[PDB]
Write a protein that binds this DNA or RNA. Structure first.
Ligand SMILES: [Mg+2]
Ligand SMILES: [Mg+2]
Ligand SMILES: [Mg+2]
Ligand SMILES: [Mg+2]
Ligand SMILES: [Mg+2]
Ligand SMILES: [Mg+2]
Ligand SMILES: [Mg+2]
Ligand SMILES: [Zn+2]
Lengths: 64, 267, 225, 129, 102
RNA sequence: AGCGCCGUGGCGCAGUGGAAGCGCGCAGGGCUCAUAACCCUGAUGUCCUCGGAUCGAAACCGAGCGGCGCUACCA
RNA sequence: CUCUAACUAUAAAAAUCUCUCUUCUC
């Protein structure tokens, strides 16, 4: 099964990770834009970009 | 051709044990072939690889050789296996390797028969091997019974009875041992006639030696007499040696002496 | 995970087909007489299901039994005692707060007041009642604590004891519970203690049933229906 | 009340291997015992939020198929003498139950509290890692 | 030398006090030199409050808060950053950090 | 004397049945300011001797050698 | 001359060290 969802990132909540490569993204689900999640992105990204996810409810904590 | 599964299905089941060979380690770990099931690949990434801290990468993996393994997840669409090696207890590893040894041994005989008759090994496993593993829990025990009892083959549908005949031949030639049953008898006599008593005792004992099972009471010491025989069913030697005990007690309870049992019959 | 080695020191069935739903009926003290549902194994003679239910206890929010939201913190333990088949009768077994309300309720810079009392009701019910109260900063306060001298604690606690024991040793459990649901006892406590100390936030917590005489079938009948 | 068939979650959430175990509203008949360790392997993610999520989805499916629709949730830390703090998987399990169909009512903390008795494990200086 | 005229404990004339156990490492410490924190927080995280409010019966649920006064030994307290090493003139200031979010 | 074993790459273990194995050793370089710990990589063997079965024996076994623990010096 | 709200998720291991002390006066 492929329950991927597209979420448009609206805010970059700074950067985290051991070496400092992964970024906080506040994504907003393209379906039902009422909902917002924070997640962790490898690679550069700006506001307005969209992301593809398999897991949807996983709101992972800060990597450390 | 060497191929085919050792167990029922082709895919490994969840939460089971296998033993796999390693051939290659790229970056995340080793995706390796299995020698307990079929021949597909399954991966161990580095997190579930070494119980100890990850210090030696190549020393503990030893590309080219076999090692115990445990399957976590199965993807029953394509043939992908998730597998580990840390998570097998010290108690477990020995039964793991024993099951592998049994599965490997049963493989070669049917390999020989398939090569000789040009029958796919899959067919031989489907016809004779799998119903034996259902009947007896495992096929090697089935072949051990086949050496002893011809009836274990009764109910199987061979692809040809010539397979049965040559398999009888090769099992009798290859799997042949007849465990030795030994015991120790204590002669505690303080009596008058004991040597002639012992002579009559061994006469009676060795008179019971059958064609297929021969009992001899060898001398190693005066009080300790060691009883040796070879039992092929591992279930007659005990009774014959208890018969020898009955003979010796009946002989010496009337000559005046005393005799006792130190070690009863045992494999 | 396969972790466990199998220290042994598939008979599969559908275990929940052997189970059935029974309704819950609450005593007439509460407005919402129907509480919920309960799952019981099917009636197999010699260990009948009716025996299986009898003795079950349950925790129910007092709002769910009153419908109001000023009772958002209390809960009632109910004990089943009677069987009708496809419908069961539960008796009051105790009352308690919610932990959240009580832990929020105790605060720094105010001495709490606790009172135990063991009582005999009108009929036979050996009960025990716990009372919790707190001092109060009066609406003029600049001495910015609200502590109370030990003698005032002894006096107030003795008042709590007399009021609780007097009220409870008068009536059967039902009249007591009906008095409890609006906490008339709370209001009378703060009324009789305000002479000594302001004694804010008086309440009654963790009322326990300790002993009941025999069966009292008729009263339980009267309380349901 | 439109016949919401209530149940109870009774979440147990420690620093290790959170538990989700639905019983009847009476707290006697088990429904969907499935635990934190059931759906994770490395045994380290036992307390991880994802473990709680997976166990929660399994419980949600089993609970919906048996018949319980609304679930009353109680979170229990390790409690007793041990550490008083809700497990990290508790929040994840609660959120996951909240999403997956089953309705929610009357969440409260049930973690036991002693009267500071039965001296806690560790010694005087305690764990001196 | 004399670093702490109050000796940290805040004891000053009571002989001895009962010792509490660290909620992290169980280091027994006198209750007064036993830096303490209130665990006043909502039972559910702010990341899921709506996820509960809409997906639950009884609209406008009270959303209860959990309460705790945890006790930290000074070793674990300084390691886990709840208490912070402060400059010599700064050790005077007993005032809290002025309402973290003002 | 018979039994219960064993026969090593330098030492220790191991499967015995698909045919040179791992640690401890040692040489070399690697980390280190530097030594030790730790990384990695090598050059060396009749897995004791004669046979017999085997597509195959170092491996299954016998007919013998050497080293052992007992039984026990067994007129 | 005027008011009490925001709360998070850190612990693998790391032993040892040889010379040599040279000064202040218009
Ligand atoms: Mg240390
Ligand atoms: Mg330390
Ligand atoms: Mg100092
Ligand atoms: Mg000094
Ligand atoms: Mg202090
Ligand atoms: Mg004094
Ligand atoms: Mg030294
Ligand atoms: Zn501590």
């Amino acid at each position: 099964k492929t329950p991927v969802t597209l979420a448009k990132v609206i805010k970059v909540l700074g950067r985290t990770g051991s070496r400092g490569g992964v970024t906080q993204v506040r994504v907003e689900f393209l379906e039902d834009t009422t909902r917002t999640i924070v997640r962790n992105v490898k690679g550069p990204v700006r506001e307005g970009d969209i992301l593809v996810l398999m897991e949807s409810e996983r709101e992972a904590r800060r990597l450390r | 051709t060497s191929h085919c599964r050792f167990y029922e299905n082709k895919y490994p089941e969840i939460d089971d044990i296998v033993m796999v060979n390693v051939q290659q380690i790229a970056e995340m770990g080793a995706y390796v072939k299995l020698l307990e099931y079929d021949n597909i690949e399954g991966m161990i990434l580095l997190s579930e690889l070494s119980r100890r801290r990850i210090r030696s990468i190549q020393k503990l993996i030893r590309v080219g050789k076999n090692d115990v393994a445990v399957v976590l997840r199965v993807d029953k669409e394509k043939g992908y296996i998730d597998l580990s090696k840390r998570r097998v207890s010290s108690e477990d590893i020995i039964k793991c390797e024993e099951k592998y040894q049994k599965s490997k041994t049963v493989h070669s005989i049917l390999r020989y028969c398939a090569e000789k008759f040009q029958i796919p090994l899959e067919e031989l496993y489907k016809t004779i091997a799998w119903p034996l593993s259902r009947k007896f829990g495992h096929a090697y025990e089935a072949f051990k019974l086949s050496i002893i009892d011809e009836t274990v083959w009764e109910g199987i549908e061979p692809p040809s009875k010539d397979v049965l005949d040559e398999l009888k031949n090769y099992i009798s030639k290859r799997l042949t041992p007849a465990v030795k049953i030994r015991a120790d008898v204590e002669v505690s006599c303080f009596s008058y006639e004991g040597i002639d008593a012992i002579k009559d005792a061994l006469k009676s004992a060795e008179d019971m030696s059958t064609e297929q099972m021969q009992v001899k009471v060898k001398l190693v010491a005066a009080p300790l007499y060691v009883l040796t025989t070879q039992a092929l069913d591992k279930q007659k030697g005990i009774e014959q040696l208890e018969s020898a005990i009955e003979k010796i007690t009946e002989v010496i309870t009337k000559y005046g002496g005393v005799c006792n049992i130190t070690m009863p019959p045992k494999a | 995970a396969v972790g466990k080695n199998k220290r042994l020191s598939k008979r599969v069935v559908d275990p929940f087909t052997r189970k059935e739903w029974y309704d819950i009926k609450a005593p007439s003290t509460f407005e919402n007489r129907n509480v919920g549902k309960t799952l019981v194994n099917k009636s197999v003679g010699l260990k009948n299901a009716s025996d299986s239910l009898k003795g079950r206890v349950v925790e129910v929010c007092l709002a769910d039994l009153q419908g109001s939201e000023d009772h958002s913190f209390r809960k009632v333990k109910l004990r089943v005692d009677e069987v009708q088949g496809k419908n069961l009768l539960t008796n009051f077994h105790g009352m308690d707060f919610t932990t959240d309300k009580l832990r929020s309720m105790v605060r720094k810079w105010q001495t709490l007041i606790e009172a135990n009392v063991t009582v005999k009701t009108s009929d036979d019910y050996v009960l025990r009642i716990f009372a919790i109260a707190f001092t109060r900063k009066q609406a003029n306060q600049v001495k910015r604590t609200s502590y109370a001298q030990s003698s005032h604690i002894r006096q107030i606690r003795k008042v709590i004891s007399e009021i609780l024991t007097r009220e409870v040793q008068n009536s059967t459990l039902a009249q007591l519970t009906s008095k409890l649901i609006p906490e008339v006892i709370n209001k009378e406590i703060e009324n009789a203690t305000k002479d000594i100390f302001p004694l804010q936030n008086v309440h009654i917590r963790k009322v326990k049933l300790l002993k009941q005489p025999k069966f009292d079938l008729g009263s339980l009948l009267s309380l349901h229906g | 009340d439109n016949s919401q068939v209530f149940g109870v979650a009774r979440i147990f959430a420690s620093f290790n291997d959170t538990f989700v175990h639905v019983t009847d509203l009476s707290g006697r008949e088990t429904i969907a015992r499935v635990t934190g360790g059931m759906k994770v392997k490395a045994d380290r993610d036992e307390s991880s939020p994802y473990a709680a999520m997976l166990a929660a989805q399994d419980v949600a499916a089993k609970c919906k198929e048996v018949g319980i629709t609304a679930v009353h949730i109680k979170i229990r830390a390790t409690g007793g003498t041990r550490s008083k703090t809700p497990g990290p998987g508790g929040q994840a399990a609660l959120r996951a139950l909240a999403r997956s169909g089953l309705r929610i009512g009357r969440i409260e903390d049930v973690t036991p509290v002693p009267s500071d008795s039965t001296r806690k494990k560790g010694g005087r200086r305690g764990r001196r890692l | 030398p004399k670093k702490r005229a109050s000796n940290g404990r805040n004891k000053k004339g009571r002989g001895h006090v009962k010792p509490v156990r660290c909620v992290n490492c169980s280091r027994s410490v006198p209750k007064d030199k036993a830096i303490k924190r209130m665990a006043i927080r909502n039972i559910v995280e702010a990341a899921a409050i709506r996820d509960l409010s809409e997906a639950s019966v009884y609209a406008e649920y009270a959303l209860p808060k959990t309460y705790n006064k945890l006790h930290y030994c000074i070793s674990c307290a300084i390691h886990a950053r709840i208490v912070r090493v402060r400059s010599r003139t700064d050790r005077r200031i007993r005032a809290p950090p002025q309402r973290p979010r003002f």
